[PDB]
Amino acid sequence: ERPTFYRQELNKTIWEVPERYQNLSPVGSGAYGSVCAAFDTKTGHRVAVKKLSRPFQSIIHAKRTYRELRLLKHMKHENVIGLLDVFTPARSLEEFNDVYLVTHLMGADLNNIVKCQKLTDDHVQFLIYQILRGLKYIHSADIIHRDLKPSNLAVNEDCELKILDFGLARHTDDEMTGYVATRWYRAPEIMLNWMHYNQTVDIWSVGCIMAELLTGRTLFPGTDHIDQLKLILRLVGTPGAELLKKISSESARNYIQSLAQMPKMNFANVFIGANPLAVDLLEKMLVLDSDKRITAAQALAHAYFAQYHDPDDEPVADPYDQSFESRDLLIDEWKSLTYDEVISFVPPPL
Numbered sequence: 001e002r003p004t005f006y007r008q009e010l011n012k013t014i015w016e017v018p019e020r021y022q023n024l025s026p027v028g029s030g031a032y033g034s035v036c037a038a039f040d041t042k043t044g045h046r047v048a049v050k051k052l053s054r055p056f057q058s059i060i061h062a063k064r065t066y067r068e069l070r071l072l073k074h075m076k077h078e079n080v081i082g083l084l085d086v087f088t089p090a091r092s093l094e095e096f097n098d099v100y101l102v103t104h105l106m107g108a109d110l111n112n113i114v115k116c117q118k119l120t121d122d123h124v125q126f127l128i129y130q131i132l133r134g135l136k137y138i139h140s141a142d143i144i145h146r147d148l149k150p151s152n153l154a155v156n157e158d159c160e161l162k163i164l165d166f167g168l169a170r171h172t173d174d175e176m177t178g179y180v181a182t183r184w185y186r187a188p189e190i191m192l193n194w195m196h197y198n199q200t201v202d203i204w205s206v207g208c209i210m211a212e213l214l215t216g217r218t219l220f221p222g223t224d225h226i227d228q229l230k231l232i233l234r235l236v237g238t239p240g241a242e243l244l245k246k247i248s249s250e251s252a253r254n255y256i257q258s259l260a261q262m263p264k265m266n267f268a269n270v271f272i273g274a275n276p277l278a279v280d281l282l283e284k285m286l287v288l289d290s291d292k293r294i295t296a297a298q299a300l301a302h303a304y305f306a307q308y309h310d311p312d313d314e315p316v317a318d319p320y321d322q323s324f325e326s327r328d329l330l331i332d333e334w335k336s337l338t339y340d341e342v343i344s345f346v347p348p349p350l
């Protein structure tokens, strides 16, 4: 039952795909990876086909490939990107060297919806509701996104939103000090290297995004790392007594004392003219102490989302086994685990 493949050169690289996928055309010119839009002849809809780069070149690439495929295969929710198909032109493990992932093709990211202009309060309710719905699901699998931002949120014409990650999926706290494209949406504990991050690092990002949808402007547009933190602390204040008691290190404490003491601002005096329920939710999302920050499930029940909330249609995920992340395997083992996950893929209902 193996489909017939065809080969073409696109953006100076070979693409070998099933005949199912017609009219391939490169998109994003880098911001997405090596991604083509295509017409799915089985469904009559457009799709996105991502070709992974050098997937089994090394142990690190192989484990990255395996990770992405595992995560995409897991995600089965309306507000999270899903896997429509995964394929390889290889006929056997021995010749397995390329992997293609197929998803829905979205219409625009959230920057392209906002365009430096305020959204209506009802539109903000709907967008944030959907982000939180997706995040309840992600977090229920014990997955943290860690890089939520407008470019990682895509919508269609009907304003249906999906959470994606156009970067490298991070899986541990230890990666937060590596590469990052923008830090405007990053929680202060990450910026301060406090470690022990919880899932509400993602809620911080949502708060930043929500503010920006409401005002049309970035909430914390720092020029650099230090400036990012200074802007954050001007809004949310210097740490309180309760939070200082949780800092293990004299220097971080001695550091945290070395920045100028800011009192927290009343957000009602910052988001002038906003819906008071929006301001209250923002207060609950942008708490400096992450132990006190609202969770996705809690936020879905906030009165701000009354017109959309349905406690019986905010589902959770099956458990996701991430024990592989702790393993040290050979390159051919990661490759074989990946192959087996390609073979076992079951498409979603048509």
Ligand SMILES: NC(=O)[C@H](CCC1CCCCC1)NC(=O)c1ccc(CNC(=O)c2cnn(-c3ccccc3)c2N)cc1
Binding pocket: 027, 028, 032, 035, 048, 049, 050, 067, 068, 071, 072, 075, 080, 081, 101, 102, 103, 104, 105, 106, 107, 108, 109, 138, 143, 145, 154, 163, 164, 165, 166, 167, 168, 169
């Ligand atoms: N980095 C990773 O490992 C993650 C792992 C999953 C992750 C999901 C969120 C929770 C955490 C885990 N991979 C992806 O998110 C991923 C995204 C897209 C595609 C192919 N489609 C597209 O590239 C695509 C689809 N519409 N437009 C689009 C079109 C126009 C405007 C905006 C977007 C695309 N560019 C494959 C994988």
